[PDB]
Amino acid sequence: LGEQEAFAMTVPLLIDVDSSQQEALEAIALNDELVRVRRALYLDLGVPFPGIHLRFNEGMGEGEYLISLQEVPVARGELKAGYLLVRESVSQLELLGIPYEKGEHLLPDQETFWVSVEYEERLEKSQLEFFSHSQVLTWHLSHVLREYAEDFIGIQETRYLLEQMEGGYGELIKEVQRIVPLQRMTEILQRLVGEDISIRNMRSILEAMVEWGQKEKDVVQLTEYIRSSLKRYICYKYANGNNILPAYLFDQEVEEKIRSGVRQTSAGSYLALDPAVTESLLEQVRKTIGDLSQIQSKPVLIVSMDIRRYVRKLIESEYYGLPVLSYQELTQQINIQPLGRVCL
Amino acid sequence: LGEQEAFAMTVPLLIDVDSSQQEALEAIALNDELVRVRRALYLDLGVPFPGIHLRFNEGMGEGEYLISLQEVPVARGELKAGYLLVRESVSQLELLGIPYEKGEHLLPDQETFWVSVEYEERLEKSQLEFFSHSQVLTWHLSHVLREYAEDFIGIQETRYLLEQMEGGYGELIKEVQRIVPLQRMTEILQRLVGEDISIRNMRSILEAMVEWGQKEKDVVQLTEYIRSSLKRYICYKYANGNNILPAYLFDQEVEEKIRSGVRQTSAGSYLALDPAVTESLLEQVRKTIGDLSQIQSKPVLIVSMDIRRYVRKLIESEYYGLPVLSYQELTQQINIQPLGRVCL
């Protein structure tokens, strides 16, 4: 036992589902239904995701499954599709109009109710959302990555991109590395994928990295200049229609209250107004935006560039699916259709 | 005798149990029951523990055993299971309701009373905690490491991690070594494992090492920023339930008395208020927290980040099993359920 300790590396991503399916589930693909949603999610965000280890554990129950990032279960579940109970995401009284018996739960994103596989034939005629045992699993996965993609872009992973691109763009990389150190360039790539912006376009992120890495030095400013280099991308991510975008402009009185609380002190530049002012603004927002749960068409808040960040991490608690843009990121020839200006 | 001195290295960890078992104990494993609890404890903390030498000494009695860190017995014991008296940890009047004769002691952590091996058959029916001759030994071991894990992470042991990780994360390490010297990076890894935080996740400790090792320079601040990188880990170590955490918030009046006594002088930043104020605060704590011996569910104190340390080493005498958190380490989506605010 005198062997010293034999260090063992932690696993980057891990899926632990129960036993009793290690050969029973195992048959849609569950080795080509993960690698499919990992690639299909890579081409969306661009993060070089890690290898998903798949372990069928017997220690848990029979419908349990936990998805552990680095040995801390981040989205566990007891799939009561355990035997076969293919769930329903947009479950409603329509599943009472389509009367097949239900099973209650609040599986995360939409109201989940479960029906059996004889009931499936008739409800698939009725056309609602069906999640097989693959699609119930990967969905949380494709939701775990999209929300924890700030943790897979580390100094070891960008140096993977800046090596994989050596062939294509030689003199671009040998120029960017001398201007922005790897720590600083990575502290940006995390800040893009935080707003669900896609790294994928890795060239025009380095063009705008070289251009501004000499003039600007505060990361939060530099990333607002770099988003402004993906102009005609964002116009396509948020406003899919004919150059019309449903916005929620901030009336100038507020964009000035926030620009006066930046506190550029210790490379944090924290927005520090007051625990009593934050609730004042966050109320004026909640008073106009409402809840946006019924509000369709995915609106976006639109605020000046230099505070586009601090507004984002402010309402990040209440309004999570409300992206924030800038005036600059808005490529011209976009018809902002203001839903309602946020007064004070 | 002219041989100069022939230097002989001290042993890192050493178990000295008596003779008369060197072949009699020797049969559960006692070479695979230590290496099992050493590995099982490594995957918990992450420290690369040393090799446990096992020596059966005759110089002692017949039920004695001492566990010596570097030749100073740190947890000795005369196991009065000497012949066979498998102990009981949660001994109570239930062992008078289950009337089998007892043997009194205060073996450390829970009330230890001993019963024989014919009594074992019936009390194992009654379902209380049994410690065989292995489990009485390793338990102190798995308690010695967990409490002296600040002594196994030295500059020689982190350079073992930063070499074992060269393969996986090359450019991460070649970046962190130039930012934080080995002394400074190790003075952190000791400060994590001091709070029972787990080094194990060695990547996101280096990501947050690179990020903050340039801005912050006081170790105690840097480690409070590094704990804030293991956010969604701590949420799982202290609040296992559904995002609900039983806290003991500090009312703001106190968190300001302590922030005024930091004395950042000689890289010690000692909290120096008064031997008469420390008893004032430590009384207001003891007046609300009580004793927490009956208080179940493992509550945690929750104080602002910048003094999370000085509060910890303050109550470290009285309330040892009361972990202290920050507001920052608390990942959002955690329902702090304040048990009672510590007023002044």
Numbering used by the authors:
A (entry chain D), B (entry chain E): 361 to 704
Anything the authors wrote about it?
Type III secretion systems (T3SS) are bacterial macromolecular machines that facilitate transport of protein substrates across the bacterial cell envelope. Most building blocks of the virulence associated T3SS or injectisome have a homologue in flagella and one of the most highly conserved parts of the system is a set of transmembrane proteins known collectively as the export apparatus (EA). The FlhA/SctV cytoplasmic domain is known to form a nonameric ring underneath FliPQR-FlhB/SctRSTU, but the full-length FlhA/SctV complex remains poorly characterised. Open and closed states have been described, with the open state being competent for chaperone-substrate complex binding, while the closed state has been proposed to be responsible for binding early substrates.
Out of the identified proteins we chose FlhA from the lateral flagella of Vibrio parahaemolyticus (Vp-FlhA) and SctV from Yersinia enterocolitica (Ye-SctV) for further studies, as both could be produced in large quantities at high purity using the gentle detergent LMNG. Particle classification revealed that Ye-SctV had formed a dimer of nonamers and we imposed D9 symmetry for 3D refinement, resulting in a 3.7 Å reconstruction of the cytoplasmic domain double nonamer. This assembly is not consistent with the known localisation of SctV in the injectisome and is therefore considered to be an artefact of the removing the complex from the constraint of the membrane. No high-resolution features of the transmembrane domain could be discerned. A striking feature of both structures is the N-terminal density of the cytoplasmic domain, formed by FlhAL/SctVL, which reaches out to bind to the adjacent protomer, demonstrating this well studied interaction for the first time in the context of the full-length protein in both flagellar and injectisome T3SS. In both of our structures a hydrophobic residue, Trp350 in Vp-FlhA and Phe367 in Ye-SctV, sticks into a hydrophobic groove on the neighbouring subunit. While molecular dynamics simulations suggested that E. coli SctV does not easily switch between open and closed state, our SctV and the C. pneumoniae SctV structure show that SctV can exist in the open state.
